[PDB]
Scaffold this active site. Sequence first.
Site, PDB file in Angstrom:
ATOM      1  N   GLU A  35       8.172  11.664  -7.761  1.00 59.12           N
ATOM      2  CA  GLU A  35       7.357  10.928  -8.612  1.00 59.12           C
ATOM      3  C   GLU A  35       7.009  11.352 -10.029  1.00 59.12           C
ATOM      4  OE1 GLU A  35       7.019   7.651  -8.472  1.00 59.12           O
ATOM      5  OE2 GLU A  35       7.276   7.406  -6.495  1.00 59.12           O
ATOM      6  N   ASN A  46       6.350   0.415 -17.002  1.00 64.53           N
ATOM      7  CA  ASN A  46       6.883  -0.252 -16.216  1.00 64.53           C
ATOM      8  C   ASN A  46       7.518  -1.741 -17.123  1.00 64.53           C
ATOM      9  OD1 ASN A  46       4.540   0.368 -14.031  1.00 64.53           O
ATOM     10  ND2 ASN A  46       6.683   1.486 -13.966  1.00 64.53           N
ATOM     11  N   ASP A  48       6.899  -4.657 -16.846  1.00 65.46           N
ATOM     12  CA  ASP A  48       5.687  -5.708 -16.645  1.00 65.46           C
ATOM     13  C   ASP A  48       4.987  -5.405 -17.752  1.00 65.46           C
ATOM     14  OD1 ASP A  48       4.428  -3.864 -15.159  1.00 65.46           O
ATOM     15  OD2 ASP A  48       4.037  -5.275 -13.661  1.00 65.46           O
ATOM     16  N   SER A  50       2.701  -2.966 -17.162  1.00 63.81           N
ATOM     17  CA  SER A  50       1.910  -1.657 -16.530  1.00 63.81           C
ATOM     18  C   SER A  50       2.445  -0.447 -16.710  1.00 63.81           C
ATOM     19  CB  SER A  50       1.718  -1.980 -15.070  1.00 63.81           C
ATOM     20  OG  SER A  50       3.123  -1.891 -14.590  1.00 63.81           O
ATOM     21  N   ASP A  52       2.654   3.876 -14.953  1.00 56.97           N
ATOM     22  CA  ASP A  52       2.352   4.662 -13.745  1.00 56.97           C
ATOM     23  C   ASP A  52       1.783   6.049 -14.188  1.00 56.97           C
ATOM     24  OD1 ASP A  52       3.721   2.584 -12.071  1.00 56.97           O
ATOM     25  OD2 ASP A  52       5.588   3.734 -12.051  1.00 56.97           O
ATOM     26  N   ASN A  59      -0.214   3.008 -10.240  1.00 57.93           N
ATOM     27  CA  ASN A  59       0.206   2.032 -11.328  1.00 57.93           C
ATOM     28  C   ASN A  59      -1.042   1.200 -11.730  1.00 57.93           C
ATOM     29  OD1 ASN A  59       1.531  -0.176 -12.835  1.00 57.93           O
ATOM     30  ND2 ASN A  59       2.975  -1.031 -10.939  1.00 57.93           N
ATOM     31  N   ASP A 101      -3.364   0.224   2.449  1.00 61.67           N
ATOM     32  CA  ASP A 101      -3.283  -1.203   2.274  1.00 61.67           C
ATOM     33  C   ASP A 101      -2.392  -2.118   2.950  1.00 61.67           C
ATOM     34  OD1 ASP A 101      -0.755  -0.944   1.017  1.00 61.67           O
ATOM     35  OD2 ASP A 101      -1.609  -1.343  -1.108  1.00 61.67           O
TER      36      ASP A 101
HETATM   37 AR   LIG Z   1       1.361  -0.827  -6.099  1.00 64.10          AR
END
Ligand SMILES: [Ar]
Length: 129
Positions: A35, A46, A48, A50, A52, A59, A101
Site C-alpha cells: 500500500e 482516486n 472519484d 477521494s 488514500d 480512503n 465491516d
Molecule cells: Ar473502503
Amino acid sequence: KVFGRCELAAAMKRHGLDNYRGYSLGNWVCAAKFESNFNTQATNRNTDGSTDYGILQINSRWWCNDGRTPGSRNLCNIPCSALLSSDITASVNCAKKIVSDGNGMNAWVAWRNRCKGTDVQAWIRGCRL
Ligand SMILES: [Ar]
Ligand SMILES: [Ar]
Ligand SMILES: [Ar]
Ligand SMILES: [Ar]
Ligand SMILES: [Ar]
Ligand SMILES: [Ar]
Ligand SMILES: [Ar]
Ligand SMILES: [Ar]
Ligand SMILES: [Cl-]
Ligand SMILES: [Cl-]
Ligand SMILES: [Cl-]
Ligand SMILES: [Cl-]
Ligand SMILES: [Cl-]
Ligand SMILES: [Cl-]
Ligand SMILES: [Cl-]
Ligand SMILES: [Cl-]
Ligand SMILES: [Cl-]
Ligand SMILES: [Cl-]
Ligand SMILES: [Cl-]
Ligand SMILES: [Cl-]
Ligand code: NA
C-alpha cells in the site's frame, strides 16, 4: 516516517493488530509494504476525487474527513491527516473498523492482489516479536 519491516511489525503487534479478525501479523505488514512502502506520509488520489492516506492507504470516501470528498463519510471520526502521523495509533484503530465491516482485508486492493494466498509469514520472519 518510513518504518522498517520489523519496526512496523512490532508497532502493529503492540496496538493489537496481530490476529485481529483472524489476520496474522504478516498479512498486515505485507499490506503496508504494497500500500505505502511503509511510509506513514503516503497519499494517492482516486479517480472519484477521494484520497488514500497513510501506511494502510485508508480512503476519505468512507473512513476519514479531508474536506475535499463531497458526499463522503468519516466512519473512523478522524481527520485524514491523523493517518499521516509517525504514530500509527489512528491508522491501526481505523484499520480495525475497516477489516470488521464484512469484507475483511479485501478492502485493501494491494493485500488482495499481492498478499492474499502468499507466504505472508515471510514479512515477519527474523523479527523479534
Ligand atoms: Ar473502503
Ligand atoms: Ar523516516
Ligand atoms: Ar504528508
Ligand atoms: Ar466529519
Ligand atoms: Ar474528524
Ligand atoms: Ar485525530
Ligand atoms: Ar492530525
Ligand atoms: Ar497501521
Ligand atoms: Cl521519511
Ligand atoms: Cl526495522
Ligand atoms: Cl522490506
Ligand atoms: Cl514498538
Ligand atoms: Cl483463535
Ligand atoms: Cl504471519
Ligand atoms: Cl505512496
Ligand atoms: Cl469532505
Ligand atoms: Cl460518518
Ligand atoms: Cl476533521
Ligand atoms: Cl507507532
Ligand atoms: Cl475475514
Ligand atoms: Na470523508
